[PDB]
Amino acid sequence: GTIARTIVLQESIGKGRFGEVWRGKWRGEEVAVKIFSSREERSWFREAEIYQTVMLRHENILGFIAADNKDNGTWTQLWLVSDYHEHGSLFDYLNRYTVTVEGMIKLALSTASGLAHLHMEIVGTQGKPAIAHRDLKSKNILVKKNGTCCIADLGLAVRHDSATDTIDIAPNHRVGTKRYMAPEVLDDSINMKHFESFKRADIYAMGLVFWEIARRCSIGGIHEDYQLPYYDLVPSDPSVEEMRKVVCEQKLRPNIPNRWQSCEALRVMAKIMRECWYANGAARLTALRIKKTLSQLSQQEGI
């Protein structure tokens, strides 16, 4: 179509399970283009569908531009064009850098604001359904030039129909990254007919992302090396069974160092992590509550 024909692909930046991401140039601006082959149409259409949700746009959700198709004369490519963020993922960003207390708050608060907006239902003519991500992880969050985050990779999301309490794709199977799966997802006790259960599972994964950020907070030169949650307990690419034995059976969570109690910002962050990590989903903090807590901390710090 008219958009893909005017875009020049410059570099393949990533190869995921669904599609390949490229840095492209559109009307002289950098854009990110996710390309799927003809046989991945279901995945491409679903992601285009979630990104076109009414009232979805928010400073902390990846800016979607357009879905399109491009025929090179041999095969057709299915495109999803979005805003380009040079830092890339929060995973890449935390591996490369350490952050200040201010930097940590900015990353955590923006992640929570994006999640609170996904989770929020807006009632009306131009109403927005509540949305649950189902695959929140530091590799699915991007860092913007201003040091704030935006949630990306919404292709596995589910949308709620509030009047009937029904989910748009009626999920009957476990999806997402095994390492970040909530205890109720790992042991398959989650009620997949209960939308609030998917919001609660996202909060647990956001808790693990906050732990990743806090390790990289550098105070008086003190900080931890980058690690994925459960790095000390499971192998790389862990199985459901491996995760379940740790999270559900032994009931372990990532370690919270006592030295996070000697700094106010880290203390608040530690308290949030613990309250995201309860085995009972109903006891977890909401994304709005986390946003309110970190907004108060940001104000106190003068960011």
Ligand X SMILES: Nc1cccc(Nc2ncnc3[nH]ccc(=O)c23)c1
Q: In which order are the strands placed within the sheet that holds 131-132?
A: 131-132, 158-161, 166-167
Cross-strand partners of 11: 23
Q: What is the nearest approach in angstroms of ligand X to the Cβ of residue 273? A: 26
For 151, phi then psi, to 5°, come to -75, 135
Burial environment of residue 83 by CB neighbours within 10 A (0 to 12, 13 to 18, 19 or more): middle
Q: Which residue is nearest to ligand X (CB)?
A: 32
Q: What is the nearest approach in angstroms of ligand X to the Cβ of residue 95? A: 14
Q: Are 216 and 99 in contact (CB under 8 A)?
A: yes
| Active-site residue, from 68, 135, 153, 202 | 135
Q: What is the nearest approach in angstroms of ligand X to the Cβ of residue 200? A: 23
Query: Between the CA of residue 36 and those of 22, 49, 136, what are the distances in Å?
Result: 11, 15, 21
* Cβ closest to ligand X, residue 157 vs residue 290: 157
Q: What is the nearest approach in angstroms of ligand X to the Cβ of residue 190? A: 24
Place of tokens 């009937």: 164
Q: Is 221 annotated as a binding residue?
A: no
* Cβ closest to ligand X, residue 18 vs residue 278: 18
Q: How far is it, in rounded angstroms, from Cα 87 to Cα 11?
A: 15
Q: Is 241 annotated as a binding residue?
A: no
* Residues making contact with ligand X (CB under 6 A): 13-14, 21, 32, 34, 62, 80, 82-85, 88, 142, 152-153
* Cβ closest to ligand X, residue 153 vs residue 212: 153
Q: Could you confirm whether 135 is annotated as catalytic?
A: yes
Q: How far is it, in rounded angstroms, from Cα 106 to Cα 303?
A: 8
* Cβ closest to ligand X, residue 153 vs residue 184: 153
| Nearest of 221, 223, 181 to residue 201 by alpha carbon | 181
Instruction: Give the catalytic positions in this structure.
Output: 135
Residues belonging to the binding site for ATP are 13-21, 34
